[PDB]
Scaffold this motif. Sequence first.
Motif, PDB file in Angstrom:
ATOM      1  N   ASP A 196      -1.236  12.419  -4.247  1.00 46.02           N
ATOM      2  CA  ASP A 196      -0.974  12.538  -2.786  1.00 46.02           C
ATOM      3  C   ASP A 196      -1.938  11.595  -1.995  1.00 46.02           C
ATOM      4  O   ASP A 196      -1.450  10.733  -1.265  1.00 46.02           O
ATOM      5  N   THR A 197      -3.275  11.634  -2.203  1.00 50.10           N
ATOM      6  CA  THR A 197      -4.326  10.968  -1.388  1.00 50.10           C
ATOM      7  C   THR A 197      -4.840   9.655  -2.050  1.00 50.10           C
ATOM      8  O   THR A 197      -6.036   9.523  -2.316  1.00 50.10           O
TER       9      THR A 197
ATOM     10  N   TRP B 174      -7.728  10.635   1.602  1.00 50.63           N
ATOM     11  CA  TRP B 174      -7.000  11.726   2.302  1.00 50.63           C
ATOM     12  C   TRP B 174      -5.766  12.040   1.419  1.00 50.63           C
ATOM     13  O   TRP B 174      -5.343  13.180   1.206  1.00 50.63           O
TER      14      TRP B 174
ATOM     15  N   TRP C 161      -2.181  16.449  -7.097  1.00 51.01           N
ATOM     16  CA  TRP C 161      -3.247  15.413  -7.044  1.00 51.01           C
ATOM     17  C   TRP C 161      -2.602  14.006  -7.225  1.00 51.01           C
ATOM     18  O   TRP C 161      -1.538  13.933  -7.863  1.00 51.01           O
TER      19      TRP C 161
END
Length: 13
Positions: A3-4, A13, A1
């Motif tokens: 990443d987006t 995203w 978590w």
Amino acid sequence: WXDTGADXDGXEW
Ligand SMILES: *C(=O)CCCCCCCCC
């Protein structure tokens, strides 16, 4: 978590 979305360059995203 994470990443987006780091707070600035891009968005979700
Ligand atoms: C949240 O997006 C954490 C990223 C998940 C790491 C999974 C390991 C990938 C390389 C083996």
